[PDB]
Amino acid sequence: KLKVAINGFGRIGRNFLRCWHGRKDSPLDIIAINDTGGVKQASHLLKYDSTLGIFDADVKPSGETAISVDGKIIQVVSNRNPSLLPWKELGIDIVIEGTGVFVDREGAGKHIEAGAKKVIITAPGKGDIPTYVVGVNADAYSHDEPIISNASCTTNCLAPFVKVLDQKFGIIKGTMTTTHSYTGDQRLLDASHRDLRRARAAALNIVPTSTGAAKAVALVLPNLKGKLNGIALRVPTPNVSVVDLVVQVSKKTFAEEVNAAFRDSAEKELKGILDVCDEPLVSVDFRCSDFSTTIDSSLTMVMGDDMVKVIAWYDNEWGYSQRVVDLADIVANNWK
Amino acid sequence: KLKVAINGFGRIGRNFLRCWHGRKDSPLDIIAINDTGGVKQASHLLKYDSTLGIFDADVKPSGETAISVDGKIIQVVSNRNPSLLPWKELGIDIVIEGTGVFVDREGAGKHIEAGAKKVIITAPGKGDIPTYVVGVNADAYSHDEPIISNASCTTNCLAPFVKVLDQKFGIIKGTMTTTHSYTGDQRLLDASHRDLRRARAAALNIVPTSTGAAKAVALVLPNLKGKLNGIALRVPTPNVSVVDLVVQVSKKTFAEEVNAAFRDSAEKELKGILDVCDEPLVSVDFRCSDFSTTIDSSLTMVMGDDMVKVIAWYDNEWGYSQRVVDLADIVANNWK
């Protein structure tokens, strides 16, 4: 049973801890956390979440350095330098790089310097770091890789239904726009920032932001290279987001067949990953959805017989974390 | 003919410029701006504003270390250490401290050691710093004061009607609660904060937080020392705020006679600082109100003859900033 540690206990990290706490008979065993803020703060924010709500588990301090979650004791370290974490001391098999700053080999490599055997970046890796979206190419993983990426939340949404779209109807080319819930990277009010878009009031505007989570599909889906690209729009909802894909398949078709196609994946090779929704719900209805992508069938379109349009709901925080746990399980099972 | 620098081009440094811009015959002249970013953000965010909208003026860069605002050109420095600012170089006379991290005598004195001849904290002071409020006591300023404080947005709203309330009824003791718009201090989503509450999603929550305005009022209203107390409630509104004051007065009275008094003031002394509104308005209807305090007379109650409750509106960003300038001018007009 592997020993996990969460580095960077922000939104993703906490979601991960809860997603993990959720799994029955897990190959993982979270033993440590590390955020700049210390125990007192780790415990509070874990317990009280403006989004996920109040964690239905017995959270509370243990000693003066650890916390206890339903009796499970988790050490809470606090060092801004990955290089100086007690990983070797705690016997950490894998690290969940959730800080969003250690994404290249140098960055994450420190976690291995520190004594941990594997880093799993919860974001677009950098350099020649092997990326994986569970349910698509998560099978490509070999134990040789110490540091890996799990892509972005958007990428984890498209890949599964784009896998289905290019697979069957063969994708010629496509564009994409994701109307996304703002995230920690934006200002609350107009204050300086590098990206003049993100510097504006997040919960007030509709902010557009160059993504790159489109082209990224190429990594997990060798094919789609140079075929996809896109942008994102940020909107006044703290969570849950939606993907707008306009592909151009070769094999002509119609909606009923497109979604029909999805439903089949949904029960075949993408169960627990892809989901199709026929009931007319809204963003918030997808809070805590374990599906990297849920299609809005009543929204599918086809123009010119070949120009296919699909709509997908995803919980930017929750679902992605559910994946990150799966990816860790994968790592934990093909543990050479 | 008075050189002025703006240290901290944030929500307050910016409203100051725009407050000052619309100034009929200023004794001041904004020479420079300093922050972390340069002209890229300086200019961009002075022309745009998810609160004050587009700035009507030709805001365009003027080199790579300056900007042009309707012809006149303002230098744009970028060092976080006030000792290193070319205050002597440009020969600045007075500094607007709006960084929010140099409110202490030691820290604010840095602009003085870097050239500037006088500093003004756009916040409450720490150390031997004279605190002044326009309409209440800014008429006690002495030209020999190197560093001074304009207090906070909340105290500036409170001090005015408390002055009228005490002078005309005599306050025994009292309490206040300011329902205030969120600020850059809070988090967009549950992120870390020294304050476990401000660390909660600012646009999804009503966040209780402490305020020192109630004790501050005694700074400028001596007869008030130790009679007030209060807290703040951060609500999901980007700007404009309201203080809810309750005071036990010495002289028995009634809602109407009170407002009557408030009116006499908005006309005689606090004319221009305080304003009794009668319209059944709302928060937004108060944007850019140049008044420190606008009393909603309709809301004014009087329980059991001596327990008075007043509700005053104020624009935390804009109304304050105007006071700043005003005091900045008081400084100018006492020079030497």
Binding site: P124, H180, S192 | -
Partner: peptide, 21 residues
């Protein structure tokens, strides 16, 4: 440009933080 540099050493700061979503 000042900011770009600042960010290079303070990637997690308010005026830097950049996420792919």
């Amino acid at each position: 440009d000042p900011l770009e540099e600042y960010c290079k050493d303070n990637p997690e700061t308010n005026e830097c933080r950049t996420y792919d979503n």
